[PDB]
Design a protein around this ligand. Structure first.
Ligand SMILES: Cc1cc(-c2c(C)nn(C)c2C)cnc1-c1nnc(N(C)Cc2ccc3ncc(-c4ccc(CN(C)C)cc4)n3c2)o1
Ligand SMILES: [Cl-]
Ligand SMILES: [Cl-]
Ligand SMILES: [Cl-]
Ligand SMILES: [Cl-]
Length: 275
């Protein structure tokens, strides 16, 4: 049918031949896998600098799920959503297949680190309120796009937002207890309104210039803390208007939280009103 037709079309475009790809040095590495710099030889002859993420259920079933999921993500097209360039599956000597995700290289890195570096002399300069709000608008735009097409991010945070060369923010690294909505801690349930909660936390990260959420509260304490109605406190010199917007993202009833489209309008309006 059309459902299967649309799936098979998407699966065609997603794979990249390993020979079109040169790996470079390791940028990050941990339990989940590794991120490396690389070069992707394109159809026009020239090479493109890329980031290559290698990821660790070793079975063929898991690989098929990965390729299908990758096909969907490859289909995203919005300037505030990271564009997946393709995937390569390299193989190991023990027979274990190793999936690799190819992404545009973002020399300015993730937004969280950038906010922290901005408080250091040698890093980027002090970030004014207008720019912080612009980061939030950009993220709201990307999430608005994603929720329109019923894609749940599942791990929205400043560390998973990337800065492009023009300082546009894009959402990335699609799925951290302190970013998880109260209902999702409770019932293991997750909607676009759970993403909205995470977005509020991300707004708070940006306005505090990279503070960890809920200082003095342990991860194991988080459910009971939220259960009694406590929320992230207003940062110092944060506009009450801006605080109201982030606060609305953590209303207890998920149906009372605004949509991303609503939040995005609110943020643009506030940004407009600044001198
Ligand atoms: C979009 C996406 C999808 C999937 C995925 C999943 C899950 N399932 N399936 C089926 C797929 C296809 C997995 N990951 C992503 C993803 N999106 N963004 C990222 N990355 C890795 C972040 C990123 C992106 C570009 C980029 N340029 C440079 C870096 C960089 C900068 C600094 C460092 C060093 N630090 C601080 C240690 C490291 C790297 N950099 C860092 O990954
Ligand atoms: Cl991109
Ligand atoms: Cl870029
Ligand atoms: Cl801090
Ligand atoms: Cl707090």
């Amino acid at each position: 049918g059309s459902h299967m037709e649309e799936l098979q079309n998407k699966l065609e475009d997603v794979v990249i031949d390993r020979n079109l790809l040169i790996l470079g040095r390791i940028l990050g590495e941990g339990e989940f896998g590794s991120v490396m710099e690389g070069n992707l030889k394109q159809e026009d002859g020239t090479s493109l600098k890329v980031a290559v993420k290698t990821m660790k259920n070793s079975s063929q079933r898991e690989i098929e799920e990965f390729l299908s999921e990758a096909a969907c993500m490859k289909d995203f097209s919005h300037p505030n959503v990271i564009r997946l360039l393709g995937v390569c599956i390299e193989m190991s000597s023990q027979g274990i297949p190793k999936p690799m995700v190819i992404l545009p290289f973002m020399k300015y890195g993730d937004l969280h680190t950038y906010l922290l570096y901005s408080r250091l002399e040698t890093g980027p300069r002090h970030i004014p309120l207008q720019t912080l709000l612009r980061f939030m608008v950009d993220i709201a735009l990307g999430m608005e796009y994603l929720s329109n097409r019923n894609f749940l991010h599942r791990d929205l945070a400043a560390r998973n937002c990337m800065l492009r060369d023009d300082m546009t923010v894009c959402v990335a690294d699609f799925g951290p207890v302190k970013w998880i909505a109260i209902e999702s801690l409770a019932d293991r349930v997750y909607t676009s309104k759970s993403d909205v909660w995470a977005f509020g936390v991300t707004m708070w990260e940006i306005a505090t210039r990279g503070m960890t959420p809920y200082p003095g509260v342990q991860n194991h304490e988080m459910y009971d803390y939220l259960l009694h109605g406590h929320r992230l406190k207003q940062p110092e010199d944060c506009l009450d208007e801006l605080y109201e917007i982030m606060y609305s993202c953590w209303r207890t009833d998920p149906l009372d939280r605004p949509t991303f489209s609503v939040l995005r309008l609110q943020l643009e309006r506030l940004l407009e009103s600044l001198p």
